[PDB]
Design a protein around this nucleic acid. Sequence first.
RNA 1: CCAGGUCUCUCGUCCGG
RNA 2: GCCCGGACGAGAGA
Length: 461
Amino acid sequence: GEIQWMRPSKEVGYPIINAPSKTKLEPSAFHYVFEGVKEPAVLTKNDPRLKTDFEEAIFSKYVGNKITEVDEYMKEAVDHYAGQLMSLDINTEQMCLEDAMYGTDGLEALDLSTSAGYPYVAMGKKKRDILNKQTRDTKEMQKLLDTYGINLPLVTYVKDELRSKTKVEQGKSRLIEASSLNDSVAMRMAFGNLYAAFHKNPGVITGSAVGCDPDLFWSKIPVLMEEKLFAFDYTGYDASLSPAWFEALKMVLEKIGFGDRVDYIDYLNHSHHLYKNKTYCVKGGMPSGCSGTSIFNSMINNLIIRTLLLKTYKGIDLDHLKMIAYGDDVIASYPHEVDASLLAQSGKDYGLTMTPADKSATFETVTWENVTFLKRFFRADEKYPFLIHPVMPMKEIHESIRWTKDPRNTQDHVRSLCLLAWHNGEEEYNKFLAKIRSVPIGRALDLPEYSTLYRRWLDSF
RNA sequence: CCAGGUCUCUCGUCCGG
RNA sequence: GCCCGGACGAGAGA
Ligand SMILES: Nc1ccn([C@H]2CC[C@@H](COP(=O)(O)OP(=O)(O)OP(=O)(O)O)O2)c(=O)n1
Ligand SMILES: [Zn+2]
């Protein structure tokens, strides 16, 4: 990805849009019961915690475009992945406007509680003003599509969220791109049966984990993997995707029968953004807040890894690759060990920055003991070895519990953390409950005992 | 008073068959 | 008891 031009939105006849400037995050009843490093990310330039220049920092990610041509390995990658998806029998038809808006089997409705994006946001117009879940009325949306069309600019916000200390000082706040409601609707009309097919088929055929529930999927994963795992992390995945990767996507889409709407992918490539008082253009890269990004990012990941394998190990048999991606996250396997330091070397040639999994300083054998996906580890149940726990380390749960957006959410919030926590085992969980109960508000909370959660987990199989 | 994307999963409240 | 569905809220993950 790479910026092409900034300029006051006035010169282009675009509205100024004002984001809020204060975080909604605030210390919890538990802020001092537990230790933690993270704090709310920089939202504005005038932030005392800044050790650098903000806007320079947040737009830094657009690292450039390495390649544009689909090379021979990419082509092979495309053919293999596409042929895989072909076995699912994906419905290639446009989705009617009603299902695109209101959801169908495998596709949730548009989120009524989020922004409707440009131009609606500058007209003080909301999704609730346009959509009606009970009647599923399409008349008003249809009119708006006719009136304003598609391919509208995105609106740019900084995400309000917790960030490590170094990310705060260095102004590394993540940016969000708010899709227009017209575009979300158009993208779902085009690609909705694709999204649903993916959501219904998490596993190694789609090469995607979208639609999975870790409490249950964790037990499937090791059975689906080949004998030898490998994994790594990307630095700046989306912003480092060069145009060649998107053509490769379009080629996969053409192959499985979406050829007639691959023009939508070109739109995701040449995008305009409104940020505060400015307007810019990006070339390449896929905006995160666009519809389908989850599916498309996972798809490209499937392409990237096949490509790197074909380049790095001549004569590799891709039929023996088993991988599951969730966007840039990935757990992968092959019947013989593959060296991710070698994969990362080849990655450089396609613009990709690949580093050791889970922030190791060096590349090391990935084992069932140290491998993580969706931030969770894998640990066999002591009593039932074939049942695997997704184990999210207490560290993250402690960071989360220390903050709140609204103290009215305390019960919901802590209870959700419990469902993540208990997988660390009865002893760590009980220690967790004691801490919570060490302050009065914690004693007002109804929290599940270990044995309840465990029986619930066993039952759910 | 509001404001701040796309998705998945889960829990909770309430309401149904 | 068990099943299923809906509206809203929240949490985590990508
Ligand atoms: N709020 C978010 C967070 C993540 N993602 C998607 C986009 C990128 C991908 C990977 O996200 P992370 O690896 O968790 O963050 P990052 O983009 O690499 O930023 P950082 O390196 O600072 O964590 O997931 C997203 O769509 N929306
Ligand atoms: Zn442009």
